C-alpha cells in the first residue's frame with residue numbers, strides 16, 4: 001500500500017527554553033495542583049512580532065477545523081452540522097476514521113474554492129483525564145535514525161496512517177495544484193505533526209511549497225534531534241498556544257523534549273493579539289516565559305472557539 005519512505009527526506013540532522021522562566025518565576029502557590037511541575041490550575045500570570053489580521057484569521061480557520069472534529073456529526077457523521085460548521089460547510093468530506101484501540105478520530109476533506117486538501121485530527125474525548133494521565137515514553141522514531149518521540153503519539157497516528165495516507169495521496173493525484181494542510185488540537189496536534197512528516201517522507205510531490213501544518217495546544221512530540229529533523233523538512237509549521245495553556249509545556253523541556261514550529265502565542269482576546277516568536281525551534285520569549293504558571297482552562301478555548309467540546 002503506502003509509497004516508500006524517501007531516503008533524502010529521512011536524513012538524520014540546543015538549550016532549555018523553559019529554564020529562564022522556571023528560574024525567574026519562582027514557586028507556585030501551595031494551593032496549585034501540578035502535572036510534571038506545570039500548574040494545572042494557576043489563576044494568573046507570574047525575533048518577536050505581532051501577527052496581522054490575515055494571519056489571525058488563518059489561524060482561526062484551522063482552529064475551527066480542529067474544533068469541529070470533536071463533533072460526532074462531523075466524525076464519524078461526515079456532515080457539517082455543528083455550532084462552527086458554517087465556516088467549513090463548503091468542504092467535501094472525503095473520509096473519516098474512529099480507530100479501535102487508540103480512538104484516533106480523523107478526517108480528510110477537500111475545499112475546491114480553497115484549492116486545499118485538509119487533514120484534521122481530533123484530540124482526546126476526555127481532555128482533563130488525558131492531561132492528568134499523560135505519561136511520556138521516549139522511543140526511536142522509526143523513519144529517522146537518531147531521533148526519538150513519545151510512543152503514545154506514534155501509536156495514535158500509526159493506527160490510522162495506512163488508510164489515511166492512501167486517501168490523501170489519491171486526492172492529491174486528482175488535484176495536483178492543491179495545497180495539503182494538516183491541523184489538530186491537543187493530542188490531535190501531535191498526530192497532525194506525525195502525519196505531515198509522513199506525507200513529506202512518502203510523497204515527492206509535497207514540499208515546503210504545498211504542505212502546511214497548523215496545530216493548537218500541541219504537546220511536545222520528540223527530542224531535540226527530532227525537532228531539528230522537523231526544521232530540516234522546511235514544512236511551514238505554525239504552532240498556536242493560547243495564553244497559559246499547560247499542554248504546549250508538556251512534557252517539560254527539561255525532560256529532554258523540544259518543539260519545532262514557529263510559535264504563535266495568543267496573549268489577549270480583547271482584542272485578539274498574537275505574539276509570534278520568529279524561530280523554527282521554540283524560544284524562551286513567548287509562552288515559555290510564563291511557566292510554571294500554566295492552566296488547563298486555557299487549553300479549552302482558542303480564538304473564542306471551544307476546543308474539545310463541541311459547544
Ligand SMILES: *[C@@H]1O[C@H](CO)[C@@H](O)[C@H](O)[C@H]1NC(C)=O
Pocket residue numbers: 031032033041042043
Ligand atoms: C487547584 O485544584 C486543587 C485540586 O482540585 C484544589 O485543591 C485547589 O483549590 C485549586 N487551586 C486553584 C488556584 O484553582
